[PDB]
């Protein structure tokens, strides 16, 4: 069989139109004063939104 669908219009869901899903919340606390920072874990995680 011959095919041209498998070209840039291949079986994928259409290019790579993907933005980090607005996933659940993780942390929200506000701080004044000197510079402040927090950390999270990559375990079972592949993305974040800041």
């Amino acid at each position: 069989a011959l095919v041209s669908l498998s070209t840039l219009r291949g079986a994928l869901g259409g290019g790579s139109i993907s933005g980090i899903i607005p996933q659940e919340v993780l942390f929200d606390q506000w701080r004044a004063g000197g510079n402040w920072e927090v950390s999270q874990s990559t375990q079972n995680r592949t993305g974040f939104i800041v």
């Binding site: 069989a1 011959l2 095919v3 041209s4 669908l5 498998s6 079986a11």
Partner: protein, 49 residues
């Protein structure tokens, strides 16, 4: 054979070439629709089909 409405002979070399030269090609293959990684795509891997 009956070449040119004439009873004559040809070299096997010629007959072989004629058959292969008319052996067709991939161009005449049909154009299909659905596809998946389940199916396979022809190609040359390390010098072999």
């Amino acid at each position: 054979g009956c070449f040119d409405n004439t009873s004559s002979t040809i070299t096997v070399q010629q007959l072989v070439n004629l058959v292969l030269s008319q052996a067709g090609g991939l161009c005449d293959l049909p154009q299909a629709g659905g596809i998946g990684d389940n199916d396979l795509i022809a190609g040359c891997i390390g010098g072999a089909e």
